Amino acid sequence: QDLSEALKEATKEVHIRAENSEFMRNFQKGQVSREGFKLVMASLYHIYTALEEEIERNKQNPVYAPLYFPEELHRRAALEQDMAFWYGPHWQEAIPYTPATQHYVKRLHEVGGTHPELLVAHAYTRYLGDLSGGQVLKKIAQKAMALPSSGEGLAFFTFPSIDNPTKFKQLYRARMNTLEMTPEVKHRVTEEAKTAFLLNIELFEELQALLTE
Numbered sequence: 001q002d003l004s005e006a007l008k009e010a011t012k013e014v015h016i017r018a019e020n021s022e023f024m025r026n027f028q029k030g031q032v033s034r035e036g037f038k039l040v041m042a043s044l045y046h047i048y049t050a051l052e053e054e055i056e057r058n059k060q061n062p063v064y065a066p067l068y069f070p071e072e073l074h075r076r077a078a079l080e081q082d083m084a085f086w087y088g089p090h091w092q093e094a095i096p097y098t099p100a101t102q103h104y105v106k107r108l109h110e111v112g113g114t115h116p117e118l119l120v121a122h123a124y125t126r127y128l129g130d131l132s133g134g135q136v137l138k139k140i141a142q143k144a145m146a147l148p149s150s151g152e153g154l155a156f157f158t159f160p161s162i163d164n165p166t167k168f169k170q171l172y173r174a175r176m177n178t179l180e181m182t183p184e185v186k187h188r189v190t191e192e193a194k195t196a197f198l199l200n201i202e203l204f205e206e207l208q209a210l211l212t213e
């Protein structure tokens, strides 16, 4: 079975659970406030910073290199622009770093440092979702919070180097199917992608609790 298919199949159930997290339900209904959106985007700042450090560390390693797409995909610079927008010029010392965020970062550094054959699972889980449900969320966010079509405060959701997300995802899936693959790597990559989904779910549960507290 091709990796791209194995990953879709492995993560389709936990996807359902993630897209139905209370924080995401509320977001999809349009009940997302500046407070909640700041907390999530700050958390993503730390998450993508770690992920993309680890991508940089492993950019020439063949277990990842075919998916090395900084210009098209990487989010840290976008998130920096969003953090300055939402939190102002001293955002670096204002932004929160929640425990669930720390836990996600920790696993990212474990994977990138010790299990880099699994890094594809973490890239898959975040980037392909940003090009899918993230595009739906971006539109809801604009409407709910009165964010301008010019893009300020939603740089994260904007991919100026991708003309067509549908086509890019197809290319990405096909490239995933070029990685060197054995039954062990395939089993473990799919497992790690389920873990990646759970780390996201836990983050959303945490952020919802922080907002409700």
Ligand code: HEM
Pocket: 004, 007, 008, 015, 018, 019, 020, 024, 025, 028, 124, 125, 126, 128, 129, 130, 132, 133, 134, 136, 166, 169, 196, 197, 200
């Ligand atoms: C309200 C929240 C969300 C909605 C509405 C949403 C919606 C979607 C939709 C319609 C697709 C299919 C795209 C296609 O076939 O090209 C998709 C795929 C994906 N989503 Fe989400 N999603 C949401 C949350 C999540 C979250 C929390 C994650 C992970 C953190 C995630 C990760 C993915 C991934 C990795 C894919 C690609 C699946 C594949 O083709 O193998 N999504 N999502």
